[PDB]
Structures are given as C-alpha cells and as structure tokens.
Amino acid sequence: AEGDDPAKAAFNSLQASATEYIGYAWAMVVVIVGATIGIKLFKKFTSKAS
Known about the structure:
- This protein is an all-alpha fold.
- It contains two helices and no strands.
- Belongs to the inovirus capsid protein family.
C-alpha cells in the first residue's frame, strides 16, 4: 500500500531539508570511528609483548 504516513512524516519531510547540516556531520563521524583506529593501532603495537 502506497502509505507514506502523511502525519508526522510529511512534517518531518520539511525539517529533513537541512542541506546545510548534511556534510559537516559526516566529518564528525570520521572523528568518532577514525579516532578509534588510532588508539586501537596503539594497543596492538603496545600489547605485543613478544
């Protein structure tokens, strides 16, 4: 059924037009994950104990 919920959806469809926020948020994401790979890579080399 072609039901796209015209109640809250439609209203949210307007707020979702924030093309000024869909870009800088992506860079922040990398700073969340990529930020782990850094410290993570450190534990590996520092947890070798060969």
